[PDB]
Design a protein around this ligand. Sequence first.
Ligand SMILES: [Mg+2]
Ligand SMILES: [Mg+2]
Ligand SMILES: [Mg+2]
Ligand SMILES: [Mg+2]
Lengths: 391, 403
Amino acid sequence: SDLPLRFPYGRPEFLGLSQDEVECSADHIARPILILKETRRLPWATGYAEVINAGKSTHNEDQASCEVLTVKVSCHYWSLFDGHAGSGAAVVASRLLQHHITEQLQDIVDILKNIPHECLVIGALESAFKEMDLQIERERSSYNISGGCTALIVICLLGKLYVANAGASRAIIIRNGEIIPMSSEFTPETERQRLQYLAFMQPHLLGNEFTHLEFPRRVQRKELGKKMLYRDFNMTGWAYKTIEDEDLKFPLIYGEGKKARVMATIGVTRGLGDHDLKVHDSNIYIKPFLSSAPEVRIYDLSKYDHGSDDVLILATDGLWDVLSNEEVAEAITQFLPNCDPDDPHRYTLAAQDLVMRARGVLKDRGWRISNDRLGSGDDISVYVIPLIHGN
Amino acid sequence: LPLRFPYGRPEFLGLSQDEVECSADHIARPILILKETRRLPWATGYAEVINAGKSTHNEDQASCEVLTVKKVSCHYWSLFDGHAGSGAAVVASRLLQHHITEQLQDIVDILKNSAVLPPTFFTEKKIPHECLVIGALESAFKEMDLQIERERSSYNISGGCTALIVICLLGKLYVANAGASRAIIIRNGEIIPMSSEFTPETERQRLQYLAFMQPHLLGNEFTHLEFPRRVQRKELGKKMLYRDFNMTGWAYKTIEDEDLKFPLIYGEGKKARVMATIGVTRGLGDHDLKVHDSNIYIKPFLSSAPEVRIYDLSKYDHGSDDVLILATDGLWDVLSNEEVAEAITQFLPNCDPDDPHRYTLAAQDLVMRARGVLKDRGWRISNDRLGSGDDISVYVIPLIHGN
Ligand SMILES: [Mg+2]
Ligand SMILES: [Mg+2]
Ligand SMILES: [Mg+2]
Ligand SMILES: [Mg+2]
């Protein structure tokens, strides 16, 4: 907090917002939906829309970055970062991760003439994420790179899409109405076993304040000796255990779904930054359980002649927390057949339509969407990328 | 030290010990089948054959019985592929069913009702009945191992073994696997996999990560990194491809002395090895298994935890030919799921559907198609392919008895 910012906080550079415009966008009551000006066209006529959260942070902590890299060949790059505990990490990542990608790819650019080649691309991305973190880790001592962020990027390289995800953002393809998932989320519920095992193997990271076991609820001192249900790292099911003091510490993973936390602190298990993140008023470091390694899924743009409405949707959890893949698919396939297939603004409007269907409208009782469901109060950022440019 | 149990063949073969001797012939390789006089539960079929020479004993073991759980019926099939001795596989084939029975007794009352009970805002968590059975099996493997760990000092429980079991409990099948054996259901020609193998290839990242976290487990003779081939000293300083625990792809590294140690995982595929010793990563026993002439213990990298997959026998009215195949790697090392699927659906339509010996004949047919015939060019199967020289054990379980 004593250090200067590495970059000024801003919105994605491609929005071309002046800083009077940036202020007007930060409204928690009107929640203006920013879209991509028609004067500024993104690669592949990519559509983008975003909206600031309903009040839980003064800044929109999402960041987005979109440009065409050049490897000494062309490499298109889209990226989304969901910031938490500050905007520093996401801002930094949205400007620098592409250069770690470009440089890791330069190591193998020649070999990409003719171990499959795809596995070399995947390895470069995994190296780039590791190298983007670490740089945050070392420059942390010279700049205020606050907090951390999830990181979802995609590159088009020689006719294939690589979707690298480390966090809770999500990518799906809508190809002729059908949903092809391009990522899976990294939350305490989905990555329990890794965390529990690392706690079992290195129990000092639990700081005599947590247990690596998971129970159906909170265990009380009242209940010592009774047969309670437990789940260990090597288990997917549940069996009965007698409660033994150590079982009275706070569970390392507690909470059913979207409400589920690692050491009662963080609801996502992968991403960048958070290097000095510590437990709730404690001195236990969270980062030993966090990982900067992404999962990479490949889509080969050649196996199929895509249509005007065949799109890759990228969005932060702000979208997916209120909308299923099927609703998102419904909204796209309902909307895009109503815009002229030659309109370059066509996909930005689809991005806007999705954000609107997740943000909702403002009632006396809060933000509400369709069927009196509660709307998302998070930041929402949406990319609609038309696959037809990959044919 | 004495044996915990005598070496033998599966009890349901009713073999005398003269019959067991003639069965251990590495040249004739006789295919043993289930005598028609002895029916297994559900008229399950069984066949087996000894290896082509790599051990004097058939080191596979099998066990099949109907358990009774009391504070209900629980059908039980099991396969064990032993290595480095017969002791571990024998013990498990006699005792693991008792560990399953005992873990199930704790929850048997809960299981014949609705809702599971954690004892005996402010959110709780509901745990389905299936999740308690899964927890029992996982505990059972842990307890079967461990008992081997401690009784090891009083009896000669040699070696280790992989373990694939399946139980039928209240209309659901639970297939628990810890090793490289395999289970598939062949339902109306379609292949439903019910297991996945646990080998150095399939569990690379877990092993590398554990080696990274506790490098004392490598004793300065191995590196936790993987390379596309063996790293030579001549390549110190050069840019080579490597793969670490957090990677699915490959990137470039400078070779840095430590990268000259022996790879923790080496070998192309199924022929991949952990610390140059064992080609499977899960199962029982192996407690004093050490590295090739070393004092480094392997067991820290092995796991007795099984993967458990559930098949609901209620969702569909099975046919005479809808079967669950259990078999040791000896079958799958030369036969794909599709060949086995082809062979079952080709064979069974030729036996009367009420024939109780019908599925044993299919089991025998599968073993035959994997063992082959021996001329001069080796053991050869169809299309001049090289036959399996491992022990082979096959179960054909008719799913129709589960309707
Ligand atoms: Mg955020
Ligand atoms: Mg968020
Ligand atoms: Mg064997
Ligand atoms: Mg074998």
